[PDB]
Design a protein around this ligand. Structure first.
Ligand SMILES: CCCCCCCCCCCCCCCCCCCCC(=O)O
Length: 133
């Protein structure tokens, strides 16, 4: 069910990521470096455990989870959140909750590209990744 998401993905387009980071309270210097990084996202499965790595010259992260089971997460910007990832409409939907706040990280495949939509507050960001062979 998640299998077309698996693999190594490289960032090839970003829209409104500064808006998203600023909504989350990320400081200007961090937003500045993040606006020029191009992460690699690696999505691997082992049985029903998924591991999602995000690698860059600035910040690395890694999470492991089962679909539909809440997990603790510490984000790249150091928020301690309660997370859950599920498949919804063929999209991989990651919801983070903290301090009564929420943000969603939604991944959808369109013409072989992975489109990540990041929503917090009113800010909506769309990032596009292409597979690596
Ligand atoms: C988990 C993302 C880590 C790699 C980040 C790229 C280099 C620096 C960015 C981190 C800056 C703090 C803002 C983080 C906000 C939260 C996660 C955004 C992930 C975006 C993506 O996966 O394309």
């Amino acid at each position: 069910m998640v299998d077309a998401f698996l693999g190594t993905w490289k960032l090839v387009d970003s829209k409104n990521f500064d808006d998203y980071m600023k909504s989350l309270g990320v400081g200007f210097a961090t937003r500045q470096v993040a606006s020029m990084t191009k992460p690699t996202t690696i999505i691997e499965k082992n049985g029903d455990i998924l591991t999602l790595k995000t690698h860059s010259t600035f910040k690395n992260t890694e999470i492991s989870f089962k679909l539909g089971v809440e997990f603790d997460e510490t984000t790249a910007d150091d928020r301690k959140v309660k997370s859950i990832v599920t498949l919804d409409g063929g999209k991989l939907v990651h919801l983070q909750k903290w301090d009564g706040q929420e943000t969603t990280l939604v991944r959808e495949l369109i013409d072989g590209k992975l489109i990540l939509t990041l929503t917090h507050g009113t800010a909506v960001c769309t990032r596009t990744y292409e597979k690596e062979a």
